[PDB]
Structure 1
Amino acid sequence: MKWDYDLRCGEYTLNLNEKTLIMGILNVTPDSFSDGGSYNEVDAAVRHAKEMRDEGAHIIDIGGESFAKVSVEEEIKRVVPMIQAVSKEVKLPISIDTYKAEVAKQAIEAGAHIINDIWGAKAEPKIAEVAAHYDVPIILMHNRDNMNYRNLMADMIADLYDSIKIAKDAGVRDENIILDPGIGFAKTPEQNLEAMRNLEQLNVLGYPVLLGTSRKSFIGHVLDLPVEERLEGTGATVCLGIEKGCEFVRVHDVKEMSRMAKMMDAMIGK
């Protein structure tokens, strides 16, 4: 009905109309005495991806940087072994959480299916050329180095559009474009609540929307509850986001949010 195509992720396909797709956030704790690839840290990633697969995750999101400061070179050595292990061992598409072109390239060559850019191709535009060449889905998230909005939503849609132009000029197909309001980036707590309240506006751009609100500090600001007490707050934002038409949510609490998403879907008629 609403999407006339599926997200093609190489060996896996995501239907955009069936259900809200849960992206599970891989927790990625490095080893303190290693250069990446070590058995403790790879095995904890795989076990965690398996747990999230079993809890209802549709996508595993994997990042090079969320303890120790790393170079691009060191970010590659962490993330590449984990992508190879998770993709061998867990049958779910993987997104590689990076804004760097070379990191994105290796992550796909190592098995990643979707690029997840927090800089919307703006930090490193060549990443869109990476997405264009491998023919992968790429998430362009709203971000900026300031909070000088004239009008938050208007500006956010303008900024997303500048990202889409970079992606398309680089030969990215419309079907590989997912957008994200980048909640928690370049935004006051009041702007975050404003974006949530007005999220349906993003639908005019014609692309699927991913929302990432999980455990973020605007929830803490409303509830006055620390990061480990943010499950109900996150739930509310997942529910509002599915009701405003988002196709994906990016969450830590996969069991719980799958359940809320499934109920939300049944009620709104998706």
Structure 2
Amino acid sequence: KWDYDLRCGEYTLNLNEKTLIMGILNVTPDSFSDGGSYNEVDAAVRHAKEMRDEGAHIIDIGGEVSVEEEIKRVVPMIQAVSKEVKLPISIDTYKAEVAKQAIEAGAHIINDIWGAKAEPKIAEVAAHYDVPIILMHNRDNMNYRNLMADMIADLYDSIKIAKDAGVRDENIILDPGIGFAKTPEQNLEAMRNLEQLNVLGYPVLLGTSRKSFIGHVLDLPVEERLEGTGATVCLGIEKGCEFVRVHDVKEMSRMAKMMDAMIGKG
């Protein structure tokens, strides 16, 4: 199906072998420093190692409240994790300056929850360093005419912005942005029709881990949503996503591996 591998730098990710697991890194900050402290960075490195050991294929590191200090927080973490954990790293920001810094520090993938709409300059950064970028569907409103058709239009608006900056098709990944700009019922609708994103011809990453719509369905708090997240990950993979962004790496990695075997992946 995919005639190219995801090229990340020192690491390369096969898209046909298996559903690739993106581990979400804890960011419990130090109430005492501007960022960089030992307790903060060591908990971060510790979490990455655990996630690596539980089957994560990528570590996702997020800083999100001002620009200049977002770098201070996230830069020291990328430096330590990239050094001590042999996995590609993605920076969860939508800020151009931030992204530059993070790749500078050793991040391999950009993760923009605004799909280059918040700060289009980020796309230039992406093209510049030749890294893969994740373009999530988002918008500042919920007034959809046709949810799915609008998501695809919105997404395509991100691709245009990215290609116009020189981003290669092979370094583009899409995300339906579940839990963003969508009502609980709209979140279910996107899930139910996720396979439509495939027509755009790009690897799709899904991120539904522990989110409120799972809560709204099950009536369960964030810590009780492991079975709910599992359902959305299974249905996601059946509908053709290549990546999942989860908190419970051990559990999700197991279901993902079983789905893969069943649906003939790899």
Q: What TM bracket, shorter-length normalisation?
A: over 0.9
Match for residue 187 of structure 1 among 177, 182, 193: 182
CA distance in 2, matches of 1:131, 1:38: 29
Q: C-alpha root-mean-square deviation of aligned residues, in Å?
A: 0.3
Number of equivalent positions: 265
Q: CA deviation at 1:208?
A: 0.2
Q: CA deviation at 1:71?
A: 1.3
Q: Deviations over 1:183-225 (max 9, x none)?
A: 0000000000000000000000000000000000000000000
Give me the TM-score of the superposition, normalised by structure 2: 0.99
Q: Deviations over 1:66-105 (max 9, x none)?
A: xxxx311110000000000000000000000000000000
Q: CA deviation at 1:9?
A: 0.3
Q: Deviations over 1:99-147 (max 9, x none)?
A: 0000000000000000000000000000000000000000000000000
Q: Deviations over 1:157-176 (max 9, x none)?
A: 00000000000000000000
Q: CA deviation at 1:266?
A: 0.3
3-state SS in 2 of match to 1:53:
helix
Question: Which aligned pairs between 1:67-146 and structure 2 lie closer than 5 A?
Answer: 70-146=65-141
Match for residue 253 of structure 1 among 248, 251, 264: 248
Q: CA deviation at 1:14?
A: 0.2
3-state SS in 2 of match to 1:149:
coil
Structure 1 runs not aligned, ≥5 long: none
Q: Which residue of 2 aligns with 1:38?
A: 37
Percent of residue pairs identical: 100
CA distance in 2, matches of 1:72, 1:90: 26
CA distance in 2, matches of 1:60, 1:73: 23
Q: CA deviation at 1:64?
A: 1.1
3-state SS in 1 of match to 2:33:
coil
CA distance in 2, matches of 1:10, 1:35: 30
Q: Which residue of 1 aligns with 2:171?
A: 176
Q: Deviations over 1:19-53 (max 9, x none)?
A: 00000000111000101100000000000000000
Report runs of 4+ in structure 1 exceeding 4 Å deviation. Answer: none
CA distance in 2, matches of 1:96, 1:88: 15
Match for residue 233 of structure 2 among 238, 262, 265: 238
CA distance in 1, matches of 2:171, 2:101: 19
3-state SS in 1 of match to 2:235:
helix
